[PDB]
Structure formats: C-alpha cells, structure tokens
Design a binder for this molecule. Structure first.
Ligand SMILES: CCOC(=O)c1cn[nH]c1C(F)(F)F
Ligand SMILES: CCOC(=O)c1cn[nH]c1C(F)(F)F
Ligand SMILES: [Mn+2]
Ligand SMILES: [Mn+2]
Lengths: 137, 137
C-alpha cells in the first residue's frame, strides 16, 4: 500500500531566491542544486524545488486553500514566526482555525504554515472544540 | 527549527468524491470528517482535504509542476498502478527518471505520483550521473 509522502515538489519561478528562502530563511538542509532545481530535506521530508517557466508568482487571494505545513516545537514556534514577520515575509491567514499555526507565503506565493502539534493532538482538541458536523472514526 | 512536514492540505471542490479517492481508491485511513473537510493519514503523512469553492477542476496543461509523491514498495508498484488504470485515473506524465514513478491526477487535478526510492537513492544516482550544473553540499 501507500506509506507516507515520498517527496514534495514545488514549482519555482526563480531558483536562487527559492533555494535561499528554504535553506537560509527556513533552515532546511540543502543537499544538491543544478541548473533547473534543488534537493533539500527538512527532517524526514524530501523537498524538491523545480524551476518551471509556467510557475507564476501568485497572490494568496488568487489561489485556493492548498497548503504545506512544517512542524515546529512549542518552544521555538513564536520566535520563528516573529523572525519571519520581521524579515518581511508575507502572510495569507491570521485566524487560528486549526490550532497553533503561523501562515506565510514563499517567494512564488506557495502557501506555507508553521504548526505545533500532531494529528492525534488535533483530533483530541477537535473533540472539545469540533468543526461543524464533525464525526470521528 | 523545522522538524518535518506537519501536514499536507489539498483544497477540493467536492468533498465526497475526494474522500472516496483518497480513502477507498488510494487506501488512506479516514480519521474524521466534518461539513467542510476531512483528516486522513497515509503512513506518517497527515492529509487534510478542505472543501473550497475556489478550487477549480484544473487540467494538467493549466497547472505548474508542483506535485505530491507517495511512497510505495517496488513489489507493490505495478498492481497499484493497474488499480488506478482500472479506475480510469488519468496520467499526466511518463516516467523518465530513476526509480519507478506513476504520475496521476486527483479528481480536482492535483498532480500526484507513486514513487519507489528515497532521497539517498536519488543523490547516489546523481553523483554517478550529475544533472547539468549539479553541485553537491
Ligand atoms: C534570513 C534572511 O532572509 C530573509 O529574510 C529572506 C526573506 N525572503 N527570503 C529570504 C532569504 F532568501 F534571504 F533567505
Ligand atoms: C547549481 C550550481 O550552483 C550552485 O550550487 C550555487 C550556489 N550558490 N550559487 C550557485 C550558482 F551560482 F552556481 F548558481
Ligand atoms: Mn494547515
Ligand atoms: Mn516527483
């Protein structure tokens, strides 16, 4: 069967600023780069940045809710979010509808998130403050 | 410091067919559903389906290369690809890279992939045959 995400590939319009964002600003590990892409890791996540002439820099009001959340500890969350804010990283959402999260944009408008907590923790929180019509299996 | 992918959220235009696709066709575990979304798991992956009227059913020629690859063993790959083919799931690309890959579309046109092989396997292959302009770190 399927077991886990093998990799996440993000199309990027300009490779160098995107590599810098994920490696320098977000602290991911850069393993390789080439004329048309880069491979990074974030813990056990394999991230590929793929230079794509079709990628457009997309304002958040023009894209749907598809988004990518990265895990961060409760101890590190607030200072990392504040550092992104002070660095001028654009945002896309403010209301915490799914727990402790910070919503921010990459250089091409990919919708990213810092989140504290696992799926198990989110299900437990939802039992007390469920979403409308929620059923648990 | 970021420790991995916390969750992947896909915006969907119709919740019921998307739940059917990810749970029944792709075999992911459904943990909860509410009027506007669902939580599933696939190995370590936390997947959220979020009902979003802004989601367009998007032909693959009209979206960029951003895509989501799921892990499967080599031994299971061919029968899973055949299951998708029997279900009429469209393919958006042929494999031309190392490691088995099957490139398929979800009901809204999200670009998915089945892939066999890790980042370490890819890096080893690239060291032997580097892409144009490739540098390692
Ligand atoms: C850590 C300094 O970097 C930034 O503030 C920033 C903001 N957007 N991209 C960056 C980058 F690429 F330099 F990492
Ligand atoms: C793709 C090889 O280039 C690199 O790894 C790299 C890293 N900083 N700058 C480069 C450059 F200029 F070659 F694009
Ligand atoms: Mn989220
Ligand atoms: Mn891929």
């Amino acid at each position: 069967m399927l077991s886990g995400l093998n990799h996440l590939t993000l199309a990027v319009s300009q490779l160098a600023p995107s590599v810098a964002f994920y490696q320098q600003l977000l602290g991911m590990t850069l393993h390789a780069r080439w004329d048309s892409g880069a491979y990074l890791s974030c813990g056990d996540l394999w991230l590929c940045l793929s230079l794509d002439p079709q990628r457009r820099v997309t304002p958040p009001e023009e894209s749907d809710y598809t988004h990518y959340a990265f895990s961060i500890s409760e101890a590190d969350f607030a200072s990392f979010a504040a550092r992104l804010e002070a660095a001028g990283v654009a945002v896309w959402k403010l209301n915490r509808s799914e727990g402790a999260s910070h919503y921010f944009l990459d250089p091409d408008g990919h919708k990213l998130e810092l989140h504290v907590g696992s799926l198990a923790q989110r299900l437990a929180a939802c039992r007390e403050q469920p979403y409308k019509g929620m059923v648990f299996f």
